[PDB]
Amino acid sequence: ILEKIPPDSEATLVLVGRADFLEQPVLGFVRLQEAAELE
Amino acid sequence: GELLHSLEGFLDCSLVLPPTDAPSEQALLSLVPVQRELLRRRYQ
Amino acid sequence: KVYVELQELVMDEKNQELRWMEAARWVQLEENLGENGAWGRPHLSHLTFWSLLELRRVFTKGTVLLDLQETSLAGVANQLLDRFIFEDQIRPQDREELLRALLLKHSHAGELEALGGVKPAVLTRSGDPSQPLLPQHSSLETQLFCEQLEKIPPDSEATLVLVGRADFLEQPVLGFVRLQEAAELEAVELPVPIRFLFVLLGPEAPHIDYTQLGRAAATLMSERVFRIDAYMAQSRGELLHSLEGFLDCSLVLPPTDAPSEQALLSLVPVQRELLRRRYQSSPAKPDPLQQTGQLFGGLVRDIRRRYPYYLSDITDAFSPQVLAAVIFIYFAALSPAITFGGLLGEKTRNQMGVSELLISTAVQGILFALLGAQPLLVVGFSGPLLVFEEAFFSFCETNGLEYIVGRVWIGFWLILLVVLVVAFEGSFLVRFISRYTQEIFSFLISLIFIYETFSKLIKIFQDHPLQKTYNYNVLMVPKPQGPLPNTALLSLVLMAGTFFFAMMLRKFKNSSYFPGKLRRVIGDFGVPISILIMVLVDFFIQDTYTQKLSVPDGFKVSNSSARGWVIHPLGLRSEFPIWMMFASALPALLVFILIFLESQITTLIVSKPERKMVKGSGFHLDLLLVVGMGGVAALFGMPWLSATTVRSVTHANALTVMGKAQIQEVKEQRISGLLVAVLVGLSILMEPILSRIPLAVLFGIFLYMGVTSLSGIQLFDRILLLFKPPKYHPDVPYVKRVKTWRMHLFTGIQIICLAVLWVVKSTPASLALPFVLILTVPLRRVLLPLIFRNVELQCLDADDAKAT
Amino acid sequence: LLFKPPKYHPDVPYVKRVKTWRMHLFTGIQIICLAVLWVVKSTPASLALPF
Amino acid sequence: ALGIKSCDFQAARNNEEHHTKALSSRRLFVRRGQPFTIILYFRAPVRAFLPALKKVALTAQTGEQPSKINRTQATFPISSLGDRKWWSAVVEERDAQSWTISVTTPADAVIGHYSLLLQVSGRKQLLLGQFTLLFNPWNREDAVFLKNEAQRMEYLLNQNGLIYLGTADCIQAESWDFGQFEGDVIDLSLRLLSKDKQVEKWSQPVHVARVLGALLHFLKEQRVLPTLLNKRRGSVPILRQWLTGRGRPVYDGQAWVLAAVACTVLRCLGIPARVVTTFASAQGTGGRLLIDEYYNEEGLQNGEGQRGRIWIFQTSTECWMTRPALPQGYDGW
């Protein structure tokens, strides 16, 4: 996994969930100003 | 809007294989010649 | 099955009249119609995402006319527009324009060439087809399949899909019509009744290709499950349900910058499961060194591997590069044939001379090129073969036994040995000759070739030394008995000039000058041009003597008093011993070992995967042919021949084209070797041509061959990387993962092996060379691992130059 | 550069900013001057070379 | 046996130590005259440390033609004998597979984009990474040194400024976003400075300030248009529009923003700066100490105005450095 990842690679985290109290599905797309190692 | 334009361009180059009773290997390998041309200009 | 027709509303080019022209037809597989007027190839239907979106949206609010009581296109159009207006799909003022559109002449492929072609159009309010305003997209199917009817069952009912554009429309509209009774319409010329009608009309929109919309509708109708549901559908809801199940089991393939067959083949279970789910709710059902343990299995597999490629083996030779390679290899095989010939002749009582070696080199080369699995090998006489023959003549002259007859029995045992080894796939052991042994053998043989080339110049300098005083009247027949002025110096000049011209033309082949066509042409013809230039150079100096090529007078025996073109196995002058009729086995064993090792290692070196050989090499077939022709030629006092390394490597190099430094492909064909053998045989006939070619020119050619044979040798590179500071070392697996001193120690061990082999060669026991070479196979596997690690040996000794 | 296909001509100011045929014409006029000077050298009036 | 695997420039911690955290946590931004720490990772364990230390050297280059005469190229070894006041490097901590190296730069180094290169005896030059060098108000030997930490914060680290507008008796403070630590402001400022060909003088804050002030005044004269049009979002959009031509232009009724743009550029490069407003400024005199105002008999002014007028206010950029080329006592603002 780590061997197959090119060194100058950045991550995309796709979060998927089901919430019955939402009226409609919502999409949130975020591009960070710089790459971050979220804790 | 630019993200939407990219997504519509992505859908413009997406190929749909309908349920076809041919054997799976030939049905899938028939997409190679078609994906190739449908991606001739996308990656130029 | 079913037949489906798709027609687009188009304009003709001659009268500018809009009309209906069929665009594609479906009998399970889709056929498309090109602009020329012929039908493209039959292919599985692939749909675009936007077409299926458009079809779903227009079908959700569509107009269904189920079990409709009519049998005419005009009246079906009438009722369809009536239900369109009733459902408010179109305004009632549009009924006149759409009925006019639906009932024009429905033209077909039979009248495309009669007219001036078809162009896309939009029906406007005035009924005038104007030019579409949206950007045009030429058909992907007209660019991939259309660029170059008995299958319909008698009981099948056809489906007609009509797609057209009309600016007079708020939104695209869909009308799906099923007739109660299948009827023939004037729109379809084929004698099949029409059951379902698809009408898709509307105005130019974003993402709506009506050709793709009609393709999607026709593909949906050609689907068995949707067709079965549509035959029994009583409402639009059931058709929408079938379309929903059709889209549920569809496979969308997103774009990717790495199109591969294996990645797409990984989607087989997805396709099978989608087909299973689509048909689950339907009432219907869906319609080269391997030991084969088989006797002569390797030989048969080599036959099935190479002989299918026989047609390309002649057609691929139609290039001037092949002709230049023929000219190169003709001299490269003729001059060693002549030289060694007179040696055996001068050392074997003219019992075996040039005549016998020219004919044997010709016959064996012809039949090996016509029958062998690796035509790029050159069959000729090698140094080990000159030394063994002198070994036999010495033994026979010692023991009174005759020569020609013993060699007749040696070949007879050789045939038995090779049949035995091919029967049990003995040529499988050539899977243990790693790059270690191959490189050692190739480098040693190249060094021997260079040494002999320089030693011939040393000899001619010895024969005609540089003196203050000479005798001006020295006998010239057969050869000059005394030293001659200006001979050695002119020979050195000619050899150096030939080598320099050949290397300069080799550089010019990869150079940057002259049109890329002429340069390459001139580049492949480098060696012939150098030979021609130096031959004309020597020919214009009439006074100075230079040694030329010498060929025999005719196709006779070198000694008419010693033997005839054939040899009695039981004796020519005396009764041959019967023990020699059995003792001939052990020297036959030695000769078989020599020929086997030489030919197999030569095939291994030539057929390396890094040299772009995609046609395969047959070890068993080539060994069988070579040893068999050796044994058969022994029945006529003719020499045994083997696939020599230098000539075969030069043949492979001269048939290899270079890319933009990178090997691209190899001209794998049989014509070059066949023509080389033919010319070697005919060399006796063309004596005037060969009698004006100096030996010094051929010495320069030999030096060129010996130098250029070191190209792919990694051992040569590691020799060089011993005199290059450990910083300029190129980025290769054996450099970047092995310590520099470890690589140098490995190279030094190979140097020790090379020195041992070279010392063995210069000793009277030079027939032990094959055995001492197979003492490197042990080390590469047994010892080596004792002083090295696994990754080190993987990097240093790699099968295809891979980083493990 | 008069014998090299144009796709190889180096990335130099006198190739990029000047048309290939114009550059070859300039090289030709210099070659004409060279030939004239060579002819002048091989004549009894070889001391007129510096003029 | 000294192959390099990777080099960790440790951008987050060094940027925190060098007061460049607001710029990035991934790109190395360091201020000259202050040590920064990198980690060198080896492919194989280093058996003997001292001979390995003898075999390695580091090189720092800036610009397109680095040279030792321009002080744009420097080659220093890794040793405890290095000059800590000059380019130097020393291993503070090590294990078998890594070296923790503290690298210093001279307090008078040329600012800009730099490349750090490793040279291992008998090998070719290896690029370790890129870093950007700035002026250091925190270093006592730097020309832009500031005595006070509060003044350092206010005049270099604060992106939330106030431009004072209005009249002398009615001063209205307008909130201003200097935004000097935006991701492209440093690159834009260095690109603008690159139009000056005296790269050897980029070590001098006076030369850099003069060049950037002249160039920014030229850009203001080129890009500010004659008369929402008055909606402002700080200095950074104005700088982007001036340098690239894209964005909302600034009109002549807000030409006072040149001072704020210059302050932003100077602050991003590491020169302490503030925006100063002078109310009732007599502009256009050429040094003459007289202003002529003409009024008609109704107490009003007829034309468009004289060349020398008393402006209601004028903004100006103040900046902090020493003045080595000037006589004694002119250091400061």
Ligand SMILES: CCCCCCCC(=O)OC[C@H](COP(=O)(O)O[C@@H]1[C@H](O)[C@H](O)[C@@H](OP(=O)(O)O)[C@H](OP(=O)(O)O)[C@H]1O)OC(=O)CCCCCCC
């Ligand atoms: C003697 C031959 C003709 C003489 C008259 C000369 C007239 C004549 O034949 O044109 C020459 C030609 C002009 O054509 P042009 O240069 O446009 O054509 C390119 C040329 O053939 C390159 O060699 C090709 O690349 P490569 O190398 O194959 O990879 C390249 O192919 P591609 O990859 O771009 O598609 C071609 O496009 O350019 C020269 O070679 C200059 C040396 C000519 C001077 C020769 C004077 C002795």
Ligand SMILES: CCCCCCCC(=O)OC[C@H](COP(=O)(O)O[C@@H]1[C@H](O)[C@H](O)[C@@H](OP(=O)(O)O)[C@H](OP(=O)(O)O)[C@H]1O)OC(=O)CCCCCCC
């Ligand atoms: C007869 C002469 C002596 C021969 C025996 C010499 C035996 C002997 O001493 O070997 C170890 C020694 C090690 O030298 P080492 O590689 O450490 O030294 C590098 C070498 O000199 C490069 O040529 C230099 O490149 P350049 O000049 O800057 O471009 C490089 O410059 P730089 O990195 O300092 O900047 C040098 O560091 O030499 C070898 O390189 C081994 C193969 C040498 C060749 C082996 C024999 C051909």
Ligand SMILES: *[C@@H]1O[C@H](CO)[C@@H](O[C@@H]2O[C@H](CO)[C@@H](O)[C@H](O)[C@H]2NC(C)=O)[C@H](O)[C@H]1NC(C)=O
């Ligand atoms: C052809 O072979 C015969 C016999 O094999 C050679 O004749 C012999 O020549 C040698 C050399 O002097 C001597 O042993 C005798 O003179 C001959 N022996 C016999 C038994 O005849 C003859 O020289 C060979 N010819 C050529 C051209 O090589």
Ligand SMILES: CC(C)CCC[C@@H](C)[C@H]1CC[C@H]2[C@@H]3CC=C4C[C@@H](O)CC[C@]4(C)[C@H]3CC[C@]12C
């Ligand atoms: C591998 C091939 C060559 C077979 C091995 C050779 C042995 C087994 C055979 C082959 C031909 C045989 C010979 C054929 C004919 C004769 C003539 C006869 O009056 C005496 C025996 C004798 C002389 C035979 C001896 C044995 C022999 C030499």
